[PDB]
Design a protein around this motif. Structure first.
Motif, short mmCIF file in Angstrom:
data_model
loop_
_atom_site.label_atom_id
_atom_site.label_comp_id
_atom_site.label_asym_id
_atom_site.label_seq_id
_atom_site.Cartn_x
_atom_site.Cartn_y
_atom_site.Cartn_z
N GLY A 1 0.74 -1.26 -0.16
CA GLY A 1 -0.04 0.08 -0.25
C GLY A 1 0.80 1.32 0.07
N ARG A 2 0.29 2.42 0.35
CA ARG A 2 0.77 3.72 0.41
C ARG A 2 0.86 4.24 1.92
NH1 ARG A 2 -1.44 8.08 -1.35
NH2 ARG A 2 -2.44 7.64 -3.42
N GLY A 3 2.25 4.28 2.49
CA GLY A 3 2.32 4.86 3.88
C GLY A 3 2.34 6.47 3.88
N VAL B 1 9.40 -3.04 3.10
CA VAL B 1 10.26 -1.81 2.95
C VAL B 1 9.40 -0.67 2.51
CG1 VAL B 1 10.65 -2.64 0.32
CG2 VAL B 1 12.13 -0.91 1.52
N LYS B 2 9.41 0.25 3.30
CA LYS B 2 8.96 1.61 2.93
C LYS B 2 10.05 2.45 2.42
CE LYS B 2 7.52 4.80 5.70
NZ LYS B 2 6.88 5.10 7.27
N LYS B 3 9.76 3.10 0.97
CA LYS B 3 10.85 4.00 0.61
C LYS B 3 10.22 5.37 0.57
CE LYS B 3 12.00 0.68 -3.37
NZ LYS B 3 11.55 0.03 -4.58
N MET C 1 11.06 -3.46 8.23
CA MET C 1 10.13 -3.72 9.21
C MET C 1 9.50 -5.34 8.90
SD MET C 1 7.15 -0.78 8.34
CE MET C 1 8.44 -0.17 7.46
N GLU C 2 9.10 -5.93 10.04
CA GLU C 2 8.37 -7.23 9.87
C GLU C 2 7.26 -7.29 9.07
OE1 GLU C 2 7.80 -10.26 13.44
OE2 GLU C 2 6.23 -8.91 13.56
N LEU C 3 7.01 -8.19 8.47
CA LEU C 3 6.01 -8.33 7.57
C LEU C 3 4.82 -8.96 8.21
CD1 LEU C 3 5.29 -8.28 4.34
CD2 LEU C 3 5.93 -10.54 4.07
N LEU C 4 3.77 -8.13 8.11
CA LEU C 4 2.39 -9.03 8.84
C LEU C 4 1.35 -9.41 7.82
CD1 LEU C 4 3.50 -6.76 11.15
CD2 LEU C 4 1.42 -7.51 12.13
N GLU C 5 1.07 -10.40 7.71
CA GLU C 5 0.34 -11.17 6.36
C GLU C 5 -1.09 -10.87 6.39
OE1 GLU C 5 2.01 -12.65 3.82
OE2 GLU C 5 3.92 -12.64 4.69
N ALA D 1 -7.37 3.04 11.36
CA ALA D 1 -7.52 1.48 11.02
C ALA D 1 -6.55 1.13 10.14
CB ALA D 1 -8.86 1.25 10.51
N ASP D 2 -6.14 2.16 8.92
CA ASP D 2 -5.16 1.87 8.15
C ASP D 2 -3.62 1.69 8.58
OD1 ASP D 2 -6.96 2.19 6.25
OD2 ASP D 2 -6.17 4.15 5.32
N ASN D 3 -3.45 2.12 9.69
CA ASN D 3 -1.90 1.91 10.43
C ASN D 3 -1.94 0.84 11.45
OD1 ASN D 3 -1.00 3.87 8.59
ND2 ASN D 3 -1.54 5.44 10.18
N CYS E 1 1.79 0.50 13.07
CA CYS E 1 2.72 0.77 11.91
C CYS E 1 2.59 2.14 11.56
CB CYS E 1 2.64 -0.21 10.75
SG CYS E 1 1.36 0.40 9.85
N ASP E 2 3.72 2.66 10.95
CA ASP E 2 3.70 3.96 10.18
C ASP E 2 4.11 5.23 11.16
OD1 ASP E 2 3.85 6.03 8.38
OD2 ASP E 2 2.28 5.25 6.93
N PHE E 3 5.17 5.55 11.47
CA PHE E 3 5.39 6.49 12.65
C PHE E 3 6.15 7.59 11.90
CE2 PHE E 3 5.31 4.10 16.40
CZ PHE E 3 5.30 2.90 16.20
C1 LIG Z 1 0.18 -8.97 3.08
O1 LIG Z 1 0.56 -7.88 3.80
C2 LIG Z 1 0.21 -6.77 3.88
N1 LIG Z 1 -0.89 -6.60 2.67
C3 LIG Z 1 -1.52 -5.52 2.91
C4 LIG Z 1 -1.06 -4.45 3.66
C5 LIG Z 1 -0.24 -4.55 4.71
C6 LIG Z 1 0.43 -5.81 4.60
N2 LIG Z 1 1.75 -5.89 5.52
C7 LIG Z 1 2.61 -5.19 5.99
N3 LIG Z 1 3.68 -5.71 6.68
C8 LIG Z 1 4.48 -4.76 7.26
C9 LIG Z 1 4.38 -3.49 7.24
C10 LIG Z 1 3.28 -2.74 6.45
C11 LIG Z 1 2.96 -1.53 6.35
C12 LIG Z 1 3.78 -0.57 6.88
C13 LIG Z 1 3.54 0.59 6.59
C14 LIG Z 1 4.66 1.85 7.04
N4 LIG Z 1 5.27 2.35 7.62
C15 LIG Z 1 2.21 0.92 6.21
C16 LIG Z 1 1.38 0.08 5.67
C17 LIG Z 1 1.85 -0.96 5.64
C18 LIG Z 1 0.18 0.88 4.76
C19 LIG Z 1 -1.05 0.24 5.53
C20 LIG Z 1 0.40 0.67 3.49
O2 LIG Z 1 -1.06 1.17 2.91
C21 LIG Z 1 0.21 1.99 5.85
N5 LIG Z 1 1.71 2.26 6.01
N6 LIG Z 1 2.26 -3.81 5.87
#
Ligand SMILES: COc1ncccc1Nc1nccc(-c2cc(C#N)c3c(c2)[C@](C)(CO)CN3)n1
Length: 331
Positions: free
Chosen positions: A74-76, A95-97, A136-140, A185-187, A200-202
């Motif tokens: 998504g977009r952070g 990874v957030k760029k 950062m850790e991936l949450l599925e 909810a988005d964060n 997430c997203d500081f």
């Molecule tokens: C299957 O995994 C996913 N599918 C959809 C949405 C999120 C995830 N997983 C995931 N895992 C780790 C980090 C993030 C993340 C970090 C940031 C930051 N900084 C961030 C988001 C996701 C947003 C929801 C991106 O729209 C907002 N800003 N997501």
């Protein structure tokens, strides 16, 4: 610190939070300065905090040592977020760029070396010229934003369960003088089975100057231009609560234009609390949506009341990804 950054600069290393944080302050200063003629070989520097991400000869460059794969998550606040894999290690993460001139050191200072199951672990950050990559850790399970959109709105027990986990994270942050600044909810990210939630997203974080996030979730003190504290997070957590219950942001279904005027002037959006809610649920949100921050409950206090509200409704019984409940209609 000034000898520490001197020794860290120009290299990617395995190290500790304070090293990343020290070097992050240098990046935020660079982003303030005017762009220069770029060198043949881009500056590459940063700190990886986990063995899952390994620097090679003190380098960590996209396409060389790691690559993104599949489409963006998504977009952070200040950058897109992708699934990535370390090519040596085979470990995946997010990874957030972020462009250097938009990068706030608080992106890293607010979550570097924190150990809460309710806060997404930071794996490190690596700079390639004018790009900062935040690992950062991936949450599925995806975002709480996506679930609410998918399900229309959440049942009360589910809303309480997630609000509850968000307030555990905000207590942890607030006791270390960290304001999240964009609680919505988005964060909030969910585990694959939906049982664990993490902040997430500081991007909007301040260490206790507050760049406000979504106007619908902003506390009256922010909108009026008064100085802010951790209580702004408690207000937004209850705006996120109303979003999960009603399937729409507060305010939006009654008012147009820049809402900032309405947030200042109106009573708190306590009328958006569904009549069908348990007494302790209604009370919890009421105490979280006090317009005066000195009288608004702490994250710790609201966390208690929400835990009690959840027990009162009979605990978490509602299924993971149940059936679509029609979001509330405009009046
Ligand atoms: C299957 O995994 C996913 N599918 C959809 C949405 C999120 C995830 N997983 C995931 N895992 C780790 C980090 C993030 C993340 C970090 C940031 C930051 N900084 C961030 C988001 C996701 C947003 C929801 C991106 O729209 C907002 N800003 N997501």
């Amino acid at each position: 610190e000034e000898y520490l950054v001197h020794a860290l600069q120009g290299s990617v290393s395995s190290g500790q939070a304070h090293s990343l944080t020290s070097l992050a302050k240098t990046w935020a200063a660079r982003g303030s300065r005017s762009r220069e003629p770029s060198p043949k070989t881009e500056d590459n520097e940063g700190v990886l905090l986990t063995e899952k991400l390994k620097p090679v000869d003190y380098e960590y460059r996209e396409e060389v040592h790691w690559a993104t794969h599949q489409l963006r998550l998504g977009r952070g606040s200040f950058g897109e977020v992708h699934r990535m894999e370390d090519k040596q290690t085979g470990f995946q993460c997010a990874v957030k760029k972020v462009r250097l001139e938009v990068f706030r050191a608080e992106e890293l200072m607010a979550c570097a070396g924190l150990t809460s199951p309710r806060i997404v672990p930071l794996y490190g950050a690596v700079r390639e010229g004018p790009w900062v990559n935040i690992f950062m850790e991936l949450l599925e399970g995806g975002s709480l934003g996506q679930l609410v959109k998918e399900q229309g709105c959440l049942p009360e027990d589910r809303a309480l369960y997630y609000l509850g986990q968000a307030l555990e994270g905000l207590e942890y942050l607030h006791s270390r003088r960290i304001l999240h600044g964009d609680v919505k909810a988005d964060n909030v990210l969910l585990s694959s089975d939906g049982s664990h939630a993490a902040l997430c997203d500081f991007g909007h974080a301040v260490c206790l100057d507050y760049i406000p996030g979504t106007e619908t979730h902003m506390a009256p003190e922010v909108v009026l231009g008064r100085s802010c504290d951790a209580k702004v997070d408690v207000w937004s957590s209850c705006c996120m609560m109303l979003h999960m219950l009603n399937g729409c942001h507060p305010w939006t279904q009654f008012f147009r234009g820049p809402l900032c005027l309405k947030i200042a002037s109106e009573p708190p959006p306590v009328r958006e609390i569904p009549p069908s809610c348990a007494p302790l649920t209604a009370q919890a949100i009421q105490e979280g949506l006090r317009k005066e921050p000195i009288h608004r409950v702490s994250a710790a206090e609201l966390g208690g009341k929400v835990n009690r509200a959840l027990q009162q409704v009979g605990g978490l019984k509602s299924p993971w990804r149940g059936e679509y409940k029609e979001p509330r209609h405009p009046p």
